[PDB]
């Protein structure tokens, strides 16, 4: 439920706002993809060039 | 409206005290100045904690402002405010109305 979490509540389950949260966010706010500089399925070879 | 850039009217200035020619111009403002007692009291009232400490107007309804003429006696220097009805369009430049002319092209 909302009391518990930024993600809580709503009549369907859903995040309702980008789950990529800023570095400068505050305690209580940082849930999900913190400081995420990209997101989505990683295509193609990784490995540090 | 368009009103004349000059105007012959009453001047109350002890020496003048008659009808003299005035230059017409349009009153503006006046920069704020801190050190007005109001700004001084406000500035203190807002220091420390407590947030906005005075009201802040939002429910605006007018879409005009009474225009005010500055009238200056070319002789006796002294000035005289006079205030016009609410209008939307004020010029005091020129272009007087013309007799009975056709519409152009």
């Amino acid at each position: 439920n909302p009391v518990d979490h930024p993600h809580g509540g709503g009549n369907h389950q859903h995040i309702g706002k980008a789950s990529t949260i800023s570095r400068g966010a505050v305690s209580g706010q940082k849930a999900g993809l913190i400081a995420a500089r990209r997101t989505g399925l990683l295509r193609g070879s990784q490995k540090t060039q | 409206v368009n009103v004349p850039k000059t105007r012959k009217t009453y001047c109350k200035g002890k020496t003048c005290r008659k009808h003299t020619q005035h230059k017409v111009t349009q009153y503006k403002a006046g920069k704020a100045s801190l050190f007005a007692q109001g700004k001084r009291r406000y500035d203190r009232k807002q220091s420390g904690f407590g947030g906005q400490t005075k009201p802040v107007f939002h429910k605006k309804a007018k879409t005009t402002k009474k225009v005010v003429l500055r009238l200056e006696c070319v002789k006796c220097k002294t000035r005289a405010q006079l205030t016009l009805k609410r209008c939307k369009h004020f010029e005091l430049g020129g272009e007087k109305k013309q007799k009975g002319q056709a519409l152009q092209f």
Binding site: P2, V3, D4, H5, P6, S27, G28, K30, A31 | -
Partner: protein, 51 residues
């Protein structure tokens, strides 16, 4: 509302590491005179699971 789960973690009450069975911390030898001028020999005496 409430303090969320990932904040409660930090006060480590029910959240501290379960430690009872652990062998002890893993560590190289203190860097003494032997190890930094020569070498010193040991025997591995037991290799052992650490919970």
């Amino acid at each position: 509302g409430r303090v969320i789960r990932n904040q409660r973690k930090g006060a480590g009450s029910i959240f501290t590491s379960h430690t009872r069975l652990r062998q002890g911390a893993a560590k190289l030898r203190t860097l003494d005179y032997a190890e930094r001028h020569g070498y010193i020999r040991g025997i591995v005496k037991q290799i052992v699971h650490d919970s």
